[PDB]
């Protein structure tokens, strides 16, 4: 387990794997608070400890992100994995659209146009994952 | 729900998530393997007794086990209790082998038995 906050800073082969390309689910809370999961691509930046995900506005998991505010990002190959946990918000505003999107591409590949494009915005705060990662 | 093209999703071999809820209701996400039987709609995943997913399972009662493929993706809810008869667990030891490969041996395994309510996933794998 590792704690993330300004004075941390995930091990190089956990940050390795967040750069590498891998698929991962996002979990959010429903209004019942039951557990939502959905396949996404995110992206982490080590610098601010922000991980965002493209999606859809008014879709059921950027509603949950707005109404329960956290969210977790797991991806796993093999036995690397890992779970990035932390406080969540969307943001619609244009300009950090436009800036997930340049981020997304990098990781993954220019994403379709979407005219109703948000960004959930993660703080991420706590990681599980592997041994071998941890640190 | 599940499509024949969702059932040999399941069937083929995947990684997973598994969502549980700490104490606080907070989600616990971990990497699984599981075996889910279109029979009963009985997903299964092996781990150590008395370990965090298994509390979580116990105690809040709710999991998700969550695979995703490329374009292809499902996540499998429903209501979840840990099983620790010993003829229970050799015969999900069976099953994950069946998909997997023979798991390591481990005398304190116990079973998180989820009973499938909800079905999510790509447009393409639902009916
Ligand atoms: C992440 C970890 O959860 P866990 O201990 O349930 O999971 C351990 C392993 O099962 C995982 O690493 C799992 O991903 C491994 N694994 C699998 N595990 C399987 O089981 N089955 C599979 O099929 C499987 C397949 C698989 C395939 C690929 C792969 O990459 C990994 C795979 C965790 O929360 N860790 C926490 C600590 C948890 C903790 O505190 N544990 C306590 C026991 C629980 C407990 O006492 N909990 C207390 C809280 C204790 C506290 O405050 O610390 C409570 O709930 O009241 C202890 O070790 O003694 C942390 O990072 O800090
Ligand atoms: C699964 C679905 O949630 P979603 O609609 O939030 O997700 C749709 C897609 O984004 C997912 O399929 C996602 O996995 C697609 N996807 C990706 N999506 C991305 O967005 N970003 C990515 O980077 C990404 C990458 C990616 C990579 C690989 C891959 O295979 C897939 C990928 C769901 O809950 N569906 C429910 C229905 C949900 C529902 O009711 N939606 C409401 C709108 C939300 C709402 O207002 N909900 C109400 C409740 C509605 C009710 O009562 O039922 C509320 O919470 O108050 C509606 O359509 O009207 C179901 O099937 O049953
Ligand atoms: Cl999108
Ligand atoms: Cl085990």
Avoid: C
């Avoid at 300009?95 to 220019?110: G, K, N």
């Amino acid at each position: 387990m590792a704690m993330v906050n300004t004075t941390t800073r995930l091990s190089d082969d956990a940050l390795a794997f967040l750069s590498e390309r891998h698929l991962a689910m996002l979990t959010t809370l429903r209004a019942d608070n039951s557990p939502h999961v959905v396949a996404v691509g995110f992206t982490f930046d080590p610098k601010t400890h922000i991980a965002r995900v493209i999606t859809t506005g008014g879709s059921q998991k950027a509603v949950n992100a707005d109404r329960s505010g956290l969210a977790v990002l797991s991806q796993v190959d093999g036995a690397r994995w890992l779970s990035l946990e932390g406080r969540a918000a969307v943001n619609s505003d244009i300009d950090a659209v436009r800036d997930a999107e340049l981020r997304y591409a990098q990781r993954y590949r220019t994403p379709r146009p979407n005219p109703r494009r948000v960004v959930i915005e993660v703080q991420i705060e706590r990681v599980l994952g592997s041994a071998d990662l941890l640190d």
